[PDB]
């Protein structure tokens, strides 16, 4: 189906403990494929997925040089942002950026993304038109004016419609046996007595990729949204993800409950029930 | 493939 | 500031005596500095790896800490997390059913 490339940048100041740390990670869908960390003994863009290792030295040199330039620019930005908010030099602050592109099954651009946050609060974002910005406050308006003067949006549009989509298509082909393989969830229902009166039914989904999934409990065919405990989808460490959904049911009523599972790896959506 | 980010905030 | 969510679980379904991986997934937190220990019977496991720092659409950070164990009937495993939002470290025990 559809696919995405994303880069995630985090810069963190730490007054009295050196210059701000800069970390960058790159993802295709739910698969990390590169990392950079300015605190590494020899900072350099490093592979994190087997299909990126075939890129030659020119690739790693370029990506490392971009990361080191970004490290310096983000240190400058953190100094500027401290001033825009009249903040003390004594505090630690965070600047985050996430950008990239979404493509459809035919490889055509669906849309581009470029968004930034300061201390966890949305700061400035490129609009979907890839030509204008939305600034959160009067500080972000300073950044917007600087980027408008330098025609930053036109550079981002060129990148997102060009290199971003071209390289995403390249990665998708080089990694097609994993990036273009949906692994369906392995599913089962467990039963956990609580008391004489109630038991927990827990619907499990294990070993699936990508992370996108829908797990729902129905009682007599009605969704139990408010009554379902749904844990956050979590990584297993082997590419795949795990999730479960639980409902508390009166003893003897277990067969009125059904678990419903949707995932792109499944040939058809699943309906499960407790099978004692 | 990353973008080169040269304009500070 | 946002305090971390914590899940402790195994990579593969737990079978006593059989080698596996113990995971502690911390998520939803801000700022990014966080201390995570994996514990075996209250003692810190020394060889614990972790994922590269990334974050979610709402800007909150997440990390996976993991190590090999072999689960048993009697050994107790846990994850101990400290963060600026926590007065004191939070311990979450590994429950095979969770």
Residue numbers in the entry:
A (entry chain A): 1 to 276
B (entry chain C): 1 to 9
C (entry chain B): 2 to 99
Show sentences the authors wrote.
We tested for association of five HLA loci with disease course and identified a strong association between HLA-B*15:01 and asymptomatic infection, observed in two independent cohorts. The crystal structure of HLA-B*15:01–peptide complexes demonstrates that the peptides NQKLIANQF and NQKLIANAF (from OC43-CoV and HKU1-CoV) share a similar ability to be stabilized and presented by HLA-B*15:01. We crystallized each peptide in a complex with HLA-B*15:01 and solved their structures at high resolution.
NQK-Q8 was previously identified as immunodominant, and these authors also demonstrated that NQK-Q8-specific T cells from HLA-B*15:01+ patients with infection were cross-reactive to the highly homologous peptide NQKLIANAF (hereafter, NQK-A8) from the seasonal coronaviruses HKU1-CoV and OC43-CoV. We refolded the HLA-B*15:01 molecule in the presence of each peptide and performed a thermal melt assay using differential scanning fluorimetry (DSF). Both pHLA complexes exhibited the same thermal melting point (Tm), indicating that the Gln>Ala amino acid change does not affect the overall stability of the pHLA. The NQK-A8 peptide bound similarly in the HLA-B*15:01 cleft. The superposition of the two pHLA structures revealed very little difference between the two complexes, with a root mean squared deviation of 0.08 Å for the Cα atoms of the antigen-binding cleft (residues 1–180) and 0.12 Å for the peptides. Only some local rearrangement around the P8 of the peptide was observed with a shift of the Glu76 side chain to avoid steric clashes with the P8-Gln. This change, which is on the surface of the peptide, could affect T cell interaction and might change the TCR affinity. All of the TCRs tested were able to bind with high affinity (Kd range, 6–20 μM) to both the NQK-A8 and NQK-Q8 peptides presented by the HLA-B*15:01 molecule. Overall, our data show that the similar conformation and ability to stabilize the HLA-B*15:01 molecule of the two NQK peptides underpin the similar affinity observed for the public TCRs. We provided the molecular basis of T cell cross-reactivity by showing that HLA-B*15:01 can stabilize and present peptides from HKU1-CoV and OC43-CoV similarly to the immunodominant peptide from SARS-CoV-2.
